[PDB]
Amino acid sequence: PTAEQLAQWEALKSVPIPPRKNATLDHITNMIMRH
RNA sequence: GAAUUGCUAGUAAUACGUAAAUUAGUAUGUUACGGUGAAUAUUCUAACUGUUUCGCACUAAUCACUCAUCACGCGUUGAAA
């Protein structure tokens, strides 16, 4: 592995994975949705 | 309001369309095709099935089998004025 990409991986070691969606808002919109 | 349909799923739903079969002609039916795309949680009840316990005089097997009744005769034995 290159050092720049090792540094990138080190930086992302600590970061939590961002959420795909807001589960509560997803639930509410799916409750609004029809058809 | 009785009533009823379907129930994790690319399913339901969709004032989403598209195609084909059957036709000379007619689809709101059928079968295909993709687009968008959810919700909910199952205390309960259960025919029926499979193991089982026990009983059994049934064995063509309970619509079973034995027992008893009623009549018809043919016998046998007993008591007898």
UniProtKB/Swiss-Prot annotation:
Subcellular localization(s) per the UniProt record: Mitochondrion
Q: Which residues form the signal peptide?
A: none
Q: What domain of life does the native source organism fall in? A: Eukaryota
User: Any idea what job this protein has?
Assistant: Component of the mitochondrial ribosome (mitoribosome), a dedicated translation machinery responsible for the synthesis of mitochondrial genome-encoded proteins, including at least some of the essential transmembrane subunits of the mitochondrial respiratory chain. The mitoribosomes are attached to the mitochondrial inner membrane and translation products are cotranslationally integrated into the membrane.
- Tell me the protein family, please: Belongs to the universal ribosomal protein uS7 family.
Another remark in the UniProt entry says:
Present with 1340 molecules/cell in log phase SD medium.
Q: How does it assemble?
A: Component of the mitochondrial small ribosomal subunit (mt-SSU). Mature yeast 74S mitochondrial ribosomes consist of a small (37S) and a large (54S) subunit. The 37S small subunit contains a 15S ribosomal RNA (15S mt-rRNA) and 34 different proteins. The 54S large subunit contains a 21S rRNA (21S mt-rRNA) and 46 different proteins.
This protein is called Small ribosomal subunit protein uS7m
Gene this chain is encoded by: RSM7
Which residues of the parent chain are present?
90 to 124 of 247
